[model samples]
Target: GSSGSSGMEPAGPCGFCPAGEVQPARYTCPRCNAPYCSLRCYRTHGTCAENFYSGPSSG
Candidate 1:
């Protein structure tokens, strides 16, 4: 499946940051497809075992 822009919030607080202050997302999860502010957050989030998906699927 193609993993295009998740179309999620482009800007938001850091997911990994304790304060979670509003910041620009620099990286995105390839599996979960969630937006993160930095690599640390992305790595902390860990692999997307759940296999998060957006939009409709193809037949």
Candidate 2:
């Protein structure tokens, strides 16, 4: 059963990215802990990010 498993990669399109449609994610948001395609996407995601994700994340 070398490849006998599900969700091995979960290589699918991301959920939302402001102008999202089928963009896959490669980075994780350190603030909201959400999926993002790039740093820019994360920045725009701050709409809901800064809502309650305000304050220091780690340091």
Best by lDDT: 1
lDDT of each: 0.62, 0.61
lDDT of 1 by residue, 17-50 (tens): 5664645666677676667787667767675633
Give RMSD to native, each candidate.
10.7, 6.5
TM-scores, all candidates, are: 0.44, 0.44
Q: Give the per-residue Cα lDDT of candidate 2 at 11.
A: 40
Where's the lowest-lDDT run of ten residues in candidate 2?
4-13
Candidate 1 segments exceeding 4 Å error: 1-12, 49-59
lDDT tens digits by residue: candidate 2, 1-59: 37646654444345665443657877666556667676667666565556555678834
